[model samples]
Target chain A: ALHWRAAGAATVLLVIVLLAGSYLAVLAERGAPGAALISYPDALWWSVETATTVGYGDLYPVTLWGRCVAVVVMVAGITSYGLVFAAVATWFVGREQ
Target chain B: ALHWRAAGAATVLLVIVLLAGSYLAVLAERGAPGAALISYPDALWWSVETATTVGYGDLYPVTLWGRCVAVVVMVAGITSYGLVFAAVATWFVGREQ
Candidate 1:
């Protein structure tokens, strides 16, 4: 009942998007004054936390350019995470039935 | 082509869940020292940001109890947000077809 292939593909795609978004955030924040995502590792952590919707708030974008990047990351996070949720839910519901 | 009724219902449900999560976070953080969600407003904002996966990093839980509450909020957010995304996607796909 679970579309394993689709789920796998979606996961891969989500990872790619998250990585790309993280890289972009890192680039955008590098020159911005008082930017929170100062390093690649920080940006990557921020990306993972945000994409998963956990948002620990340990790191964040402080500039307009970084905020714009944040917006795109948030939207992508929602869509990719939504697909994963739906896929898992479908598997569970199908199993129950 | 779109299930407006379902979408409407899901939206209402999501609002209720988000509000409930915010209240719970507020209650959990009230007595905990160093907790970021000290006030109702802070908790509410944190809840909204977390649920939307925007995570501005302005606030977060600092206690075990608050973390537990956060986990629930995050899971609930994913489910509710996933339903909304699916409903919207269905509408678009149906329109295309």
Candidate 2:
């Protein structure tokens, strides 16, 4: 059904959006004090850690800019994370197309 | 319908579960090497950030145990995060109740 297809498409879009957001956060935080903590693969790891709001604290930004970007990521990540949940809720509610 | 009620109940439960998970991760990771980075409100912020897996790396677990916990949080966060998305997908598809 169209509804099912739409739901699948929406889920894929949501994941892509989350991934893009993660990539941006990595790009923003790279090259700072603890840059080593976030180098390429590590940065990707860090982005996921932050977007999830886990705060492992083994790797952190020692530079001011990095922290600022962190704040941005934190807020956006929370919003996006909630959006995913809300989307799921809407799906269950089966709101009119 | 009962299905709608169930959906609402599940959403509420999911949010509560996420919040509780965030709190526990904070408690487990607090007062270690990067404790300063994971202090109280900041710790809560970091928890959300990590659960979402943004990994700003502005605050990470420094002590071995802390990183250990981070690993747990990261994996759990990823799992819960996906659950929320999956729930939404199911709701959209209306694949049953």
Candidate 3:
């Protein structure tokens, strides 16, 4: 069976962290170059993309601080998805066996 | 401990699919627009970006066939990361408990 709590907790946590990370992303990227993450919405998109490893190059962070935020976002995305999704596969794999 | 084989196997499969996906991506996007993935290298970048969900918007597909290939690439990305990483978390979570 799926570990409901783990997924749920991680999802919620990821959101909070996603928001917080994006807040910083906007600040760091407002003056930065490239796709130019200048607003909350832009950074929100960037945060999700980077965190999810999608880095679409649409709105990326170039500042030193922005890249720092990226590491945090990436980890959060990886942990959130990695935790439950992997558990999901394992849970199913167990059922198969 | 990590599920070594699960991660390794999925990674290898992801690579094979990634290459194939990029090949199709080039075929579909070569004549398309939006950063215009016109060559192998371009499509390779697109393939990784889409598959990883880091779309960067640098190279993307607009054609019907290109978008179709995108779905396949996205699923491959989600599945690979979701499997072993979740296993890693569960393994660690259990230790924490």
Candidate 4:
């Protein structure tokens, strides 16, 4: 009956976390090293990786604040995925009912 | 009142996915490039990474079956986290009630 609620919630959370977290991570990791996670795309990939909890260490955060942002991104990813699953379950059950 | 239900559910799921998924991924990725995700511990780490959706690509599956098991672990991770959050919410709400 209310799948869209969860869907919208997940979408918004995911968007916010990815954009904000990536931006923060980029800044946090800026002065650490030119090794990895320095560019916008790298930070964006890191954001997606963390938010999806698919944290491929191919490019990871080295600084303290970057790690902090990673923590939030991780939690947000889990919640977003949870909301997605909940939305799907609600939609399926409602259909059967 | 029923917070334990979700906690128990999450615990059981996390345990099963970590152990079983790691074991399966180890078996599945045995014949790959011998590059990564070959050892039990590596596979175990991979399992934890995927199950937590913190998939740090430090070690990843390159084979088809390995990827398949990864998919399951990823989904299970999200569900486990969802249950954990639900448990906490239920406990907090019940305490206030």
Q: Write candidate 4's Cα lDDT for A38-77 as tens digits.
A: 6778788888877876676778664566666776787787
Candidate 1 vs candidate 3: which has greater lDDT?
3
Per-residue lDDT of A1-97 in model 1, one digit per residue for the tens?
2334445566666677677877887777888853478677788788777766666666776555555555566666766665555555445444554
Model 1 residue runs over 4 Å out of place are B3-54, B59-82, B85-97
Pairs in clash, predicted candidate 4: A53-B53, A53-B54, A55-B55, A55-B56, A56-B57, A57-B56, A57-B57
Interface C-alpha root-mean-square deviation, candidates in order? 6.0, 7.0, 5.5, 6.7
Q: Residue pairs in steric clash, candidate 1?
A: A57-B57
- Per-residue CA lDDT of model 2 for A1-97, tens digit only, reads 4334544454454445445644554565665445544454665555455545655666555444455545555544554555455555655566676
Error of 2 at B70 (Å): 2.5
Indicate the DockQ of the complex predicted as candidate 1: 0.21
How would you order the candidates by DockQ, starting with the best? 3, 1, 4, 2
Superposed by TM-score, candidate 3 places the C-alpha of residue B93 at a distance from the truth, in angstroms, of 19
lDDT of 2 at A9: 57
- DockQ, model 2, C-alpha based: 0.18
How do the residues B1-97 of candidate 3 rate in per-residue lDDT, one tens digit apiece? 3454676677777777788987876776777753576688777777776777767676755555665566567668777766666556545545654
DockQ in order = 0.21, 0.18, 0.27, 0.19
- Residue-by-residue lDDT tens digits, candidate 4, B1-97: 4566776678678768877877887887887753275767557656766777676766667677788778888888768776765654443333221
